[PDB]
Each structure stands twice: as structure tokens, then as C-alpha cells.
Short mmCIF file of C-alpha atoms and ligand atoms in Angstrom, two decimals:
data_model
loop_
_atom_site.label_atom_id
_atom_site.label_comp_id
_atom_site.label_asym_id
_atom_site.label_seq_id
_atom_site.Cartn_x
_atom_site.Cartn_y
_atom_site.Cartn_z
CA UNK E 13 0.00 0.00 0.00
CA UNK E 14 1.08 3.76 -1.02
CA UNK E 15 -0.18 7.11 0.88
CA UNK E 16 0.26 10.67 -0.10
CA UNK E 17 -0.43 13.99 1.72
CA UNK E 18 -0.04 17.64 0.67
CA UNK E 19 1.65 19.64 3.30
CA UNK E 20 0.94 23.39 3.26
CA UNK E 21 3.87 25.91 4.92
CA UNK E 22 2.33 27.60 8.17
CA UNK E 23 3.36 31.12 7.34
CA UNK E 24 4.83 33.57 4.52
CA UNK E 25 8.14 32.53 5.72
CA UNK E 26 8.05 28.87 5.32
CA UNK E 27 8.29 28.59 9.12
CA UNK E 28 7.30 24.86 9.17
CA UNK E 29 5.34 22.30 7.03
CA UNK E 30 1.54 21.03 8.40
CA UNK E 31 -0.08 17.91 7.25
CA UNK E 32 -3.03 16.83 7.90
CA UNK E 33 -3.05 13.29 9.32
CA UNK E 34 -6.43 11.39 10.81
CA UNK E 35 -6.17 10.19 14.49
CA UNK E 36 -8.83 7.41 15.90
CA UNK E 37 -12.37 6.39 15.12
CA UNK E 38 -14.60 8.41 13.87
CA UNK E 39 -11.29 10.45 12.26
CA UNK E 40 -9.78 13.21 14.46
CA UNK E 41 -7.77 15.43 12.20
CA UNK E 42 -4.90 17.10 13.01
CA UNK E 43 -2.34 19.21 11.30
CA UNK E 44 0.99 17.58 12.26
CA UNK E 45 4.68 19.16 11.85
CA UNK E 46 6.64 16.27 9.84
CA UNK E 47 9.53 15.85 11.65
CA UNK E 48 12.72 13.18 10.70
CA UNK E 49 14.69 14.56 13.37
CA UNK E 50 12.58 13.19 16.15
CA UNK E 51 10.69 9.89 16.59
CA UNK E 52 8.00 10.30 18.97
CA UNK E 53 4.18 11.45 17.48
CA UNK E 54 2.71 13.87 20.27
CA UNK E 55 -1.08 15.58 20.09
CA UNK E 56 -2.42 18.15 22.22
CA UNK E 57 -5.42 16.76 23.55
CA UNK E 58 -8.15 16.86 26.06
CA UNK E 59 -5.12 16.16 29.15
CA UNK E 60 -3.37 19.10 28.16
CA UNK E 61 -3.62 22.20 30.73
CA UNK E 62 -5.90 24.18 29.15
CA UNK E 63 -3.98 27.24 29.74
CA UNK E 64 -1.17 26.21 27.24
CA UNK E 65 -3.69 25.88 24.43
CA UNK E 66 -4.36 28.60 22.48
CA UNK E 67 -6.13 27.43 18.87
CA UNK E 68 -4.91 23.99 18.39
CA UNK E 69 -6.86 21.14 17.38
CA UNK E 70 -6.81 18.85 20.49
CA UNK E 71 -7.06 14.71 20.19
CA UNK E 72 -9.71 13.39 22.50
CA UNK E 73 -9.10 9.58 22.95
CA UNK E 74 -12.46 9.12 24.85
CA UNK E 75 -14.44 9.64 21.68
CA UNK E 76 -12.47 7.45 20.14
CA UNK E 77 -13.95 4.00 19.81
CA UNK E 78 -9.88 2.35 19.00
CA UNK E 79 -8.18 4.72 21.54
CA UNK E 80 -6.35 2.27 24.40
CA UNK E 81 -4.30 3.65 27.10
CA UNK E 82 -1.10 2.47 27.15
CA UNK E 83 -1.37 1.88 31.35
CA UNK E 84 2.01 2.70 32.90
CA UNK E 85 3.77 4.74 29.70
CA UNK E 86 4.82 8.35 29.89
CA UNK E 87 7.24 10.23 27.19
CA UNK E 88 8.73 13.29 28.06
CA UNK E 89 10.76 15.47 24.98
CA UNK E 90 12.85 18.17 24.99
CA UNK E 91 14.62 19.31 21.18
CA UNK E 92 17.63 21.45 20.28
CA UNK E 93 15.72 24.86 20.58
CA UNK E 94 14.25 24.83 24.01
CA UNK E 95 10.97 23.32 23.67
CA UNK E 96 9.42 20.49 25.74
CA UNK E 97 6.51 18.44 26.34
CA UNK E 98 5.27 15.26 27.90
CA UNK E 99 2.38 13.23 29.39
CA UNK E 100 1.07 9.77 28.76
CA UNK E 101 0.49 7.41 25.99
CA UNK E 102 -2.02 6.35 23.79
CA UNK E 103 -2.50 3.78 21.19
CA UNK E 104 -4.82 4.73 18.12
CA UNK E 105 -5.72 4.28 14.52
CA UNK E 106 -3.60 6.57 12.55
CA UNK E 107 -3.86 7.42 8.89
CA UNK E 108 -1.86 9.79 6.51
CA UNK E 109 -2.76 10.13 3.30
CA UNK E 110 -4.78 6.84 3.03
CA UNK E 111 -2.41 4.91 4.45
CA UNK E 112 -3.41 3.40 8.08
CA UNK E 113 -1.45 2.11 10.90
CA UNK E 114 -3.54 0.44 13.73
CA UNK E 115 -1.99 0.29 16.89
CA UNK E 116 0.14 3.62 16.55
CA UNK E 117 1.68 5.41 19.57
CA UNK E 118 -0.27 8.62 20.37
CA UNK E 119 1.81 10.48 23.01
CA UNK E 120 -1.00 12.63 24.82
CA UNK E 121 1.18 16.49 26.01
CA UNK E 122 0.04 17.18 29.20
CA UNK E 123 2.53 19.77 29.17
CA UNK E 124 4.03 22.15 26.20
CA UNK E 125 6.22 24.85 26.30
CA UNK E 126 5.35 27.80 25.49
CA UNK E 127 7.28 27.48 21.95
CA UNK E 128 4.08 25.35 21.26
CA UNK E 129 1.44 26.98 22.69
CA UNK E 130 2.15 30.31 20.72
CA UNK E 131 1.88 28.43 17.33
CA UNK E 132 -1.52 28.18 16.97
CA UNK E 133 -1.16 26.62 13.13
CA UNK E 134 0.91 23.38 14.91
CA UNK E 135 -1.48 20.72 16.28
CA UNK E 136 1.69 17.72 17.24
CA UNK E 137 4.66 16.78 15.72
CA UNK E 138 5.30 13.25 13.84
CA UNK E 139 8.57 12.02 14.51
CA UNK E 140 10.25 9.97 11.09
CA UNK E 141 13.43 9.32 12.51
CA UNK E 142 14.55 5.71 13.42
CA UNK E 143 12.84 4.76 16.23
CA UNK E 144 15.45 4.15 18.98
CA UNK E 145 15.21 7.81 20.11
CA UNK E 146 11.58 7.63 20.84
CA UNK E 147 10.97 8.44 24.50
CA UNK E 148 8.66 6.33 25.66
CA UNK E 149 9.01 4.31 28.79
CA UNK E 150 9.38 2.10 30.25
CA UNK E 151 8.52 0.47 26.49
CA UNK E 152 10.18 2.61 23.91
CA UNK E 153 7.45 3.18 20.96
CA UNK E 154 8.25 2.55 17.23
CA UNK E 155 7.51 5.86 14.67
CA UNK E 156 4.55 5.56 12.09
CA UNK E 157 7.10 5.01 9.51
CA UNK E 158 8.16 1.31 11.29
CA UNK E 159 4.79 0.74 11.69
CA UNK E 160 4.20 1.08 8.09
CA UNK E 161 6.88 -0.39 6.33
CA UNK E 162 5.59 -4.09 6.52
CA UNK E 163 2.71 -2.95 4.08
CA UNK E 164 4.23 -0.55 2.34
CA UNK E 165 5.00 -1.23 -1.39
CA UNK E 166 8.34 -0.12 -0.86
CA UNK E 167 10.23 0.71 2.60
CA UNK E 168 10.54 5.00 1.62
CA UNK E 169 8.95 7.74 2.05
CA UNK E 170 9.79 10.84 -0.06
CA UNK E 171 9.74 14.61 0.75
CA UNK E 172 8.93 17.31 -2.09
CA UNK E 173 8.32 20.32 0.26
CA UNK E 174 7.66 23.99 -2.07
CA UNK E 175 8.94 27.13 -2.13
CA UNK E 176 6.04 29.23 -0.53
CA UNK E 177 3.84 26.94 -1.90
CA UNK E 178 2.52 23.66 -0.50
CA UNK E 179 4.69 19.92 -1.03
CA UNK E 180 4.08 16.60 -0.84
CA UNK E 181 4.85 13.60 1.42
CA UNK E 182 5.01 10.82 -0.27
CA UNK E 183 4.88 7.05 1.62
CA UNK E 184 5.67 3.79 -0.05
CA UNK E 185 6.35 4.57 -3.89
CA UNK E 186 8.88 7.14 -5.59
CA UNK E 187 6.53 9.70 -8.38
CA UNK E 188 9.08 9.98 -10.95
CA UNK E 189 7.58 13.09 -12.23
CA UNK E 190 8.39 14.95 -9.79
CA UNK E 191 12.03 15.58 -10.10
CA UNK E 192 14.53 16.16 -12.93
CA UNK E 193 17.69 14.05 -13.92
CA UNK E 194 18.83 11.10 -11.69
CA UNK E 195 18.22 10.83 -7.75
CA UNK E 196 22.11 10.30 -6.10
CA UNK E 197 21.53 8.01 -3.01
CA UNK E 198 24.29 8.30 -0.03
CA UNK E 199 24.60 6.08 2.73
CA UNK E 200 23.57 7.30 6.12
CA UNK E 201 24.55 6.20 9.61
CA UNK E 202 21.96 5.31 12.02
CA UNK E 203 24.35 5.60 15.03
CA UNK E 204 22.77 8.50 16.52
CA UNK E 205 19.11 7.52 15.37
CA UNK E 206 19.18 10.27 12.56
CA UNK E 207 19.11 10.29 9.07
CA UNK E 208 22.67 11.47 9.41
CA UNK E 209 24.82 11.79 5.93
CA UNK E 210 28.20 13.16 4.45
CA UNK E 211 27.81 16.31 1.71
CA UNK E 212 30.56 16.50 -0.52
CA UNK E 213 31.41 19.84 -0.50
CA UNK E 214 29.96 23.42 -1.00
CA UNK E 215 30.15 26.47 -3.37
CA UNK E 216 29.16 30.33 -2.77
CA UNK E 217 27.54 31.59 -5.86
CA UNK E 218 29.33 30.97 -8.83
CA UNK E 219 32.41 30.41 -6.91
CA UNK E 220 34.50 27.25 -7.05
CA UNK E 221 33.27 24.03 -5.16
CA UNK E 222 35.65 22.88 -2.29
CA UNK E 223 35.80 19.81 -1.61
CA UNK E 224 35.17 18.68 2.29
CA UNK E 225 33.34 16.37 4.28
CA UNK E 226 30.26 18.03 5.92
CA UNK E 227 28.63 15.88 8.19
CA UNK E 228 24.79 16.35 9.18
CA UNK E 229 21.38 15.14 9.93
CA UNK E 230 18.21 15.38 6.96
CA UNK E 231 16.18 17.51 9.74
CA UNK E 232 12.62 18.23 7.92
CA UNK E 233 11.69 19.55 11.26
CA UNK E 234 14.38 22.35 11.72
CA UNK E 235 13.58 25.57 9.46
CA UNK E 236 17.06 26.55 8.65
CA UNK E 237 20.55 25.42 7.48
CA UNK E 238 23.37 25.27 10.05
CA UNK E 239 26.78 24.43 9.12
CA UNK E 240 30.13 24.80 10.41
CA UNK E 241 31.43 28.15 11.16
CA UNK E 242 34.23 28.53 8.38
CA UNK E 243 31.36 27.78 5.79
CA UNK E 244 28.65 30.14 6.70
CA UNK E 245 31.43 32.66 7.46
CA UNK E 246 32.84 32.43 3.35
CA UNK E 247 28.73 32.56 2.76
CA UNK E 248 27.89 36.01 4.58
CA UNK E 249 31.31 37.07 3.51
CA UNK E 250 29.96 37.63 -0.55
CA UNK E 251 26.87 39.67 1.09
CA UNK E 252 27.52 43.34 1.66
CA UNK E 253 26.98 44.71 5.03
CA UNK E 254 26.47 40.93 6.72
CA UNK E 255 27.45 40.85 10.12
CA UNK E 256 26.70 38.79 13.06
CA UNK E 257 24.64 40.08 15.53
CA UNK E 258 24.94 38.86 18.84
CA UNK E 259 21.76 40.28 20.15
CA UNK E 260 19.86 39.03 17.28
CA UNK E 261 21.58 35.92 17.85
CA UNK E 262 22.94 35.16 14.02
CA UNK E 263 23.57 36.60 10.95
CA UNK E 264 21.84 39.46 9.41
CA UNK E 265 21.78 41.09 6.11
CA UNK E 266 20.36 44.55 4.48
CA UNK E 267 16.87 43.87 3.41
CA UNK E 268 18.23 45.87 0.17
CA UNK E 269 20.84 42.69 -0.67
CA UNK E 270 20.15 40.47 -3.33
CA UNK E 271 22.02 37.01 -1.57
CA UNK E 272 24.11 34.73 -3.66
CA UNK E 273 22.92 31.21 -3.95
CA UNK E 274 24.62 28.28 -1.89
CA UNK E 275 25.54 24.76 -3.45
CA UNK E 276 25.96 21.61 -1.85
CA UNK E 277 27.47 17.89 -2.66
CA UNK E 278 25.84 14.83 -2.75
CA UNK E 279 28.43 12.55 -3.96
CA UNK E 280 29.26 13.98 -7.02
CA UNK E 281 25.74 15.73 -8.06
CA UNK E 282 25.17 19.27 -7.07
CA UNK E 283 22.10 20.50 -5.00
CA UNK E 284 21.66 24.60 -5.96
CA UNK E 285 19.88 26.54 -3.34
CA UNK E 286 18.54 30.03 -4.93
CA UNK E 287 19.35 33.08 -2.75
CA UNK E 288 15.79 34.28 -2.49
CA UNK E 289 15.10 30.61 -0.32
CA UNK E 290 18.28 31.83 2.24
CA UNK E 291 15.92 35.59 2.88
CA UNK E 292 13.83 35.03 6.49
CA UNK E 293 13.09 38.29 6.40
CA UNK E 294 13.24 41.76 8.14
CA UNK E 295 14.41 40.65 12.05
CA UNK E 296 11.20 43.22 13.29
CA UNK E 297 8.31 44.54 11.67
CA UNK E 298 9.91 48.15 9.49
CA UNK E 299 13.37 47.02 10.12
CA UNK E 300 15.66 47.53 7.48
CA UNK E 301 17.44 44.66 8.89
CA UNK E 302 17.11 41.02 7.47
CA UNK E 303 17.63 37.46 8.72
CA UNK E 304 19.77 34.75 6.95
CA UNK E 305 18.56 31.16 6.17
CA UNK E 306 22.11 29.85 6.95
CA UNK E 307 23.71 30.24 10.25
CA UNK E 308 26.24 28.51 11.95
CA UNK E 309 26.02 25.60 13.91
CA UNK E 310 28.80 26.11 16.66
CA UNK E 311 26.23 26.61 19.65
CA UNK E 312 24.29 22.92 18.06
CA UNK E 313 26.88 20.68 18.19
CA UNK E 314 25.84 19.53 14.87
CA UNK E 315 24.92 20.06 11.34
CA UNK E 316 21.46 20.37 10.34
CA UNK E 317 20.14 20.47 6.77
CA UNK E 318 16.91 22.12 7.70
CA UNK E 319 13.89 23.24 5.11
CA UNK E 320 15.95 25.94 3.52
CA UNK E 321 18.30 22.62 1.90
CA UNK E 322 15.71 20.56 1.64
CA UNK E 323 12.96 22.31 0.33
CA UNK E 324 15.38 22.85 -2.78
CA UNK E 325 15.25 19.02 -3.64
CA UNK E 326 13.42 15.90 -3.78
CA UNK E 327 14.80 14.12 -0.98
CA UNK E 328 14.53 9.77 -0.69
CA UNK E 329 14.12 8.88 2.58
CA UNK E 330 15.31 4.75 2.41
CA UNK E 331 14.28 2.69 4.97
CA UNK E 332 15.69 -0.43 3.90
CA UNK E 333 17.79 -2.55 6.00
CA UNK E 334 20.80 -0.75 5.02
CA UNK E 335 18.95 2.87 4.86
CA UNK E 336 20.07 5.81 2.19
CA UNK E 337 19.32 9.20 1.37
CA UNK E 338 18.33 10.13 -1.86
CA UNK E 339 18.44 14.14 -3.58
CA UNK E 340 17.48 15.02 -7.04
CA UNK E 341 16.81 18.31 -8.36
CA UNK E 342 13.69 19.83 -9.08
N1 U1H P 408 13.84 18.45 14.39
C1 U1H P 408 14.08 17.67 15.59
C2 U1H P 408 15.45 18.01 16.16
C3 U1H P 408 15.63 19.14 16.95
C4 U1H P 408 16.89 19.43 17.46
C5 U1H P 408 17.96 18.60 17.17
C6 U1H P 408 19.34 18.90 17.73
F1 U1H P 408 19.44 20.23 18.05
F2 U1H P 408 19.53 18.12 18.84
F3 U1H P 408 20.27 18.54 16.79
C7 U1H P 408 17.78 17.48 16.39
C8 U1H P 408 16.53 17.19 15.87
#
């Protein structure tokens, strides 16, 4: 079996990605924030203090004739920008797309931060990395993805995500119309539980490549690109007026700048990312002062090719036993 879902960016910026995916019996929907650099799928719902919701969509188990509590289980998550969240466990009917997983992990928040409760648009998150950083205990969960993949048609799921303009998730089958050229897989280590690969290399514009081993995670859950420090310094370098601003925490840019485009390597193809997809912005309303898509990733620990990378590809997410990454341009 195949499913596909359109996911829709939650703001002018391309902030995040929401999908809507259909929780328990009747169908609960929920807009969901994609995510393969986490592995648990977490709801607001009727447990969570009502004070910290503000708009969402919130999962009810009790009218849900297939909802079972998972007696004893409680996740708690907290990711690489401060946010947090926890409470107890669920298992429910789950569907994206078409495609249907029974017996599905719904972690129930209790508790959000406050990262969450602001963003109104943002209903859960569903986790598609590899399932041993899922946080439930005492029995760790598996993601919807290993749930899947016994029915699936074939063990991937793709990601096609636009431009200001909505994408696709794709789960099961690769649409061959929907990129140009070849797709160049690379082999990812599972080590951490990410979908963690090497790029080749890196260009500035029309500058020459340079070969060097870049090592990072396929994040669709992270909105920007972070890379090492020498990098995103020869980036900002070709920008007039760039600086980084320690009180704005990052690199910013004049709004007036046109920004060169950024290359990357995946073996030996090339992934082009126009300069108008690296513009965030002006850093307050009337400021004359804009943020950059690509920042450095000193403060993380690691690299992250976030939606600015990805969203200029169609990315292969391989979940065979020996799992790759695939990119083709678009
Ligand atoms: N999108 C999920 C996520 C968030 C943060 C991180 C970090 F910061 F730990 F690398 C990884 C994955």
C-alpha cells in the first residue's frame, strides 16, 4: 500500500510544514509538523492544561472508539531549541494520506512549552526518525514510519516540500515526475538515530566548489541550514553589510541585498539553493534589517540540513535494512 499527503507551509516565511493526518475512530484530524529529526508522534489533547492551548486542534481519545491507554507509559521530549513536552500514551488508529497504521503510539502532552502553545497553526509533531530515540518508557514506541513499512509497497517515504507553496509527502512509492535528472543516493549512519549523511562539499555563488566532508542530519523539522562556522562565514562574507549580531543571535543582512545562492554535494551531483530561499526576512516589523537562512552551527553541536536545503530538492528517505538518502533536483 502507497499514501500521499499535501503539506501546506504555516506562514509567509516557510516557518514549518503542516499535514493533515487522521487520528482514531470516527477520524480526528490534526495538522501535524513532519519531523525526521525526532521519533516520537505527540497531540495536544483533552489532558493538556488548558492554559497552554491557544487554537490547536486537540485529540480526545475518549471519543475514540480504538483509543487504548497504554497503562504505565509516559514520554517526556525536549529538542535542540528549548521546547518540551510530555504526558502519557495512547495507542490509536492513525492514517496519513490513506495509508493506516492500527496500533500507533499517540503520546497525549500534558505539558508544552510555550514554543508550542504560541503556534496556533501546529497541532503535534510526527517524529520519522529511526525509532530508537523515541521516549517512551518504560517500552520505547516505534515511529509511524516502522509501523508502516511491513505494508508498504516499498520501505521509503519521499519529501517534495515547495517554495512558498505547498509539497508533498510521499509514503511507499517514488513519483518519478516529480524531479529532474537522476536521484544520487548516499549512505547514512543510524548511530545517533538520525538520518545522518556526508555532503561533498559546498560552493558560494558561482564560486568554485571545495571539496570537504560536511557531516549532518536530513532535519525536515528544523527551518534553517546550520553548518560549520568557516562555511557560513565564506557565505555572509559575498553579502555586503552581513554581520553577526549577537543580540539578534545570528547573521543578518540589508533587506536591500540580493544574496548569492549556496551549493551543496551529494556525492558527485550538485544541489543549488537560490538566494531568495536563504531571505527570512526583516528581524522586526519596518526594520531595514534582514535574517539569513544559513547560520552557523557552533552553539548545536551539529549540522542540520533544515527546510531551507531541503525544500530545494526531492529528498529519498530509504528505509531499507541498510537505509540511504536520496536528492534530485527539481
Ligand atoms: N527536528 C528535531 C530536532 C531538533 C533538534 C535537534 C538537535 F538540536 F539536537 F540537533 C535534532 C533534531
Amino acid at each position: 500500500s502507497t499514501g500521499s499527503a499535501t503539506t501546506t507551509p504555516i506562514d509567509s516565511l516557510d516557518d514549518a510544514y503542516i499535514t493533515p493526518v487522521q487520528i482514531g475512530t470516527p477520524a480526528q484530524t490534526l495538522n501535524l509538523d513532519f519531523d525526521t529529526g525526532s521519533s516520537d508522534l505527540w497531540v495536544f489533547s483533552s489532558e493538556t492544561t488548558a492554559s497552554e492551548v491557544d487554537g490547536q486542534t486537540i485529540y480526545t481519545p475518549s471519543k475514540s472508539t480504538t483509543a487504548k491507554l497504554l497503562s504505565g507509559a509516559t514520554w517526556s521530549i525536549s529538542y535542540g531549541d528549548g521546547s518540551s513536552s510530555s504526558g502519557d500514551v495512547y495507542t490509536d488508529t492513525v492514517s496519513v494520506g490513506g495509508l493506516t497504521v492500527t496500533g500507533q503510539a499517540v503520546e497525549s502532552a500534558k505539558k508544552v512549552s510555550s514554543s508550542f502553545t504560541e503556534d496556533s497553526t501546529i497541532d503535534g509533531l510526527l517524529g520519522l526518525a529511526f525509532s530508537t530515540l523515541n521516549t517512551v518508557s518504560p517500552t520505547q514506541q516505534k515511529t509511524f514510519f516502522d509501523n508502516a513499512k511491513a505494508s508498504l509497497d516499498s520501505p521509503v517515504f519521499t519529501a517534495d516540500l515547495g517554495y512558498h507553496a505547498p509539497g508533498t509527502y510521499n509514503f511507499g512509492f517514488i513519483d518519478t515526475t516529480a524531479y529532474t535528472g537522476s536521484i544520487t543516493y548516499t549512505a547514512v549512519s543510524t548511530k545517533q538515530g538520525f538520518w545522518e549523511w556526508t555532503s561533498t562539499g559546498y560552493a558560494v555563488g558561482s564560486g568554485t566548489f571545495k571539496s570537504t566532508s560536511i557531516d549532518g542530519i536530513a532535519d525536515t523539522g528544523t527551518t534553517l541550514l546550520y553548518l560549520p562556522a568557516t562555511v557560513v562565514s565564506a557565505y555572509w562574507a559575498q553579502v555586503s553589510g552581513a554581520k553577526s549580531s549577537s543580540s539578534v543571535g545570528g547573521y543578518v543582512f540589508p533587506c536591500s541585498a540580493t544574496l548569492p545562492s549556496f551549493t551543496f554535494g551529494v556525492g558527485s551531483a550538485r544541489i543549488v539553493i537560490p538566494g531568495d530561499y536563504i531571505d527570512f526576512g526583516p528581524i522586526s516589523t519596518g526594520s531595514s534589517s534582514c535574517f539569513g537562512g544559513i547560520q552557523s552551527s557552533a552553539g548545536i553541536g551539529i549540522n542540520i540540513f533544515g527546510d531551507v536545503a531541503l525544500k530545494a530538492a526531492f529528498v529519498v528517505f530509504n528505509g531499507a535494512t541498510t537505509p540511504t538518502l536520496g536528492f534530485a533536483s527539481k
